[PDB]
Structure formats: structure tokens, C-alpha cells
Estrogen receptor-binding stapled peptide SP1
Amino acid sequence: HLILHLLLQDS
């Protein structure tokens, strides 16, 4: 799930 976050925070 961490990836799902590193994706939202990056954007």
C-alpha cells in the first residue's frame, strides 16, 4: 500500500 501513497504525495 506504501506505493499507493508515494504516488499521491509525489503528485
Observations:
- The helical segments are 2-8.
- The CA atoms of residues 5 and 11 lie 10 Å apart.
- The first helix runs from residue 2 to 8.
- The two ends are 16 Å apart (CA to CA).
